Symmetry: C5
Subunit: 98 residues, 5 copies
């Protein structure tokens, strides 16, 4: 389950906590309309991973992609802090769990 | 099978979807006529991976190479959205499947 | 157990030595108040990973993250040199143990 | 076996094709006279991996290193297209085979 | 053992050849007095990994880190060519063995 730290951090924002997601697809797309990085869960939930050109968010977003692709490759769960009502929702924080 | 999101995204473009591809070779080549990154499937299909110098497609294209390489290393399938306008066809989107 | 080398170095600073930590969560966050990379241990300690934009510490901090994330993926223990001056405590050196 | 694509591409050059090579050493060296990345095979052949500062061969040469290390780490074979104009011969293209 | 090539490149003794090393600790440290990347062997030896800001040695020193990291994670042996001019000795070349 999300650490208490990760829960509390997400609770102080308007984004929503999503716990124990199994991500099963990892997507890179450069098509004009859908240019971005996305993940899909075992039940078809789709999320876009945040991106940032500059330091220091270019580091946190690169680490978001690493977390996302390790979850897909290794079958580990993630907890997410992201939009609740859209599709795709965007990820603003992500927790990889062992 | 490709996620619904990935198929919808490819359907908005001039490219074609290829599903459940087993990639068995990953190539890097700096020869004058043959400069690029490529993948080869179990069936003999050949695709060129897109590249991009600048933000933000420098991000997506780096992840396309990670996805390609992981598919070869781990034996995971990929779904591609690939343009027939060149030869090898150029990957415009790729989905790694757990 | 921490190397003597690693202990002695941390003893040159105001930080404390934390040994044999099992990290089980790896977090990337870009929300405004909690922008950063973090780890959580099996007993619920939380640390922030240092960051740096420029050479040479851009290298050292990129490896701290690699270390932290391999620890979470693979269950290896880490030793930390972590300052207790802030919450969460900031990692200033880390040692991955095979 | 090398893909027909990889083989045709190498045949367009003055370089030589070397197929099914087992790499057993991956070397980084910054000594004055041998400054470079090299690989050694099971039969004692040695090759120097290409490098490039500028886009887009900075991408291709990075992926060549990733391929050579993965080969060493995971015992996968490679096919190389290597120029005998210097010694160690230089890798102008490399194909990782699953 | 070390490849003949790696041996011959270290030789001349201005530097020290260390063969068959098992690395069991990998260290990142940003404290100013001891800022660097280091490794610790099973016998308790400690080395500093070289660093470099500019091309092309920024590539080799990045690969030295990867090799050091892989040795610790995976238990692979390395051979080193290190300078006895300082303590810890500085790795000027490293060979990862399959």
């Amino acid at each position: 389950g999300a650490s208490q730290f990760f829960k509390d951090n997400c609770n102080r924002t308007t984004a929503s906590l999503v716990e124990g997601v199994e991500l099963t697809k990892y997507i890179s797309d450069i098509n004009n309309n859908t240019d971005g990085m996305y993940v899909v869960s075992s039940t078809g939930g789709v999320w876009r991973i945040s991106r940032a050109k500059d330091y220091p968010d270019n580091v946190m977003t690169a680490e978001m992609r690493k977390i996302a692709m390790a979850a897909v490759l290794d079958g580990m769960r993630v907890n997410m802090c992201a939009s609740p009502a859209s599709s795709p929702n965007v990820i603003w924080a992500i927790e990889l769990e062992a």
